[PDB]
Scaffold this active site. Sequence first.
Site, PDB file in Angstrom:
ATOM      1  CG  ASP A  39      -2.183   0.656   1.077  1.00 32.14           C
ATOM      2  OD1 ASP A  39      -2.029   1.809   0.810  1.00 32.14           O
ATOM      3  OD2 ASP A  39      -3.253  -0.120   1.040  1.00 32.14           O
ATOM      4  CG  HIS A  69      -5.152   3.860   1.574  1.00 35.16           C
ATOM      5  ND1 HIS A  69      -4.850   2.558   1.074  1.00 35.16           N
ATOM      6  CD2 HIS A  69      -6.527   3.694   1.246  1.00 35.16           C
ATOM      7  CE1 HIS A  69      -5.922   1.764   0.484  1.00 35.16           C
ATOM      8  NE2 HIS A  69      -6.997   2.551   0.852  1.00 35.16           N
ATOM      9  CG  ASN A 161     -13.670   1.366  -3.516  1.00 35.81           C
ATOM     10  OD1 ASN A 161     -14.128   0.172  -2.621  1.00 35.81           O
ATOM     11  ND2 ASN A 161     -12.418   1.778  -3.095  1.00 35.81           N
ATOM     12  CB  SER A 224      -9.036   0.158   0.784  1.00 35.78           C
ATOM     13  OG  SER A 224      -8.807   0.390  -0.313  1.00 35.78           O
TER      14      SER A 224
END
Length: 279
Positions: A39, A69, A161, A224
């Site tokens: 990530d 994130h 998403n 996520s």
Amino acid sequence: AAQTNAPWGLARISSTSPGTSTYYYDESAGQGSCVYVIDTGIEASHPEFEGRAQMVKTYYYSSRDGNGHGTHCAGTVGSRTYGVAKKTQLFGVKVLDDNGSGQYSTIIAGMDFVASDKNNRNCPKGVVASLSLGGGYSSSVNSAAARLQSSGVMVAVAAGNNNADARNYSPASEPSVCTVGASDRYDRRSSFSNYGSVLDIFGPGTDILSTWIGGSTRSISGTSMATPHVAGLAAYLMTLGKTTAASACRYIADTANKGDLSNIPFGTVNLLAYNNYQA
Ligand SMILES: O=C(O)[C@H]1O[C@H](O[C@@H]2[C@H](O)[C@@H](O)[C@@H](O)O[C@@H]2C(=O)O)[C@H](O)[C@@H](O)[C@H]1O
Ligand SMILES: [Ca+2]
Ligand SMILES: [Ca+2]
């Protein structure tokens, strides 16, 4: 073990019903397992990680998570308060810059990196990788994810998403890895969650509280956020000896809460990750 007033998602994955707030789990808590979070990085110094997190790779000028994130995702995997597997070892692999962007070539390198790097780490109970990222379909990206899985790593990946069929996104669309959709606290598919035959499992993804950079916390939403629930769950189950890297996605689907989610399109699994813990 019982953690009172836990984040709703942790309660949910240890419950047969929505609407409770205590997380129940075997105290082994993923000890002896390892989870790579691929990530934007991880703020390893965050008190919530208790020294159990470390950066092991970056493709940018720094290994620091300047975005948040990656730290949030790691927190859902393994932070003390916000994590599923509260005793796992977390390894950070920074394939995304501090704006959350990354080229597919870098992402692929990061995946092949974990496949090798696990041989440098002590993970007797097994190895998981959590990939809360993706883009348009790429056979090379899917291949990379399939290699990582084949190498002995439980690869969990976000569905995306777009409120669309995940078949058109990578690595979501790779059949051999564990593709994770998102649900909300009322057992609805999250309105942004991708869906489709390629989904394996849902996890909590709407309004998920976890760690953030600057030693902080916040609640955000996405596939996520669902993905590391599943990754942490795999590590937890692997530590208990219930399953292995090769079989964990199947095992989680097998033992899931079934039929409980709403707004699941025809042809998408109605399966919600569950740890089957009986105190
Ligand atoms: O070795 C090959 O090239 C053959 O298998 C390939 O699969 C890749 C790995 O070999 C396998 O262990 C896992 O990682 O899946 C990989 C992938 O999907 O790329 C390919 O199917 C072909 O190249 C085949 O010849
Ligand atoms: Ca749609
Ligand atoms: Ca799959």
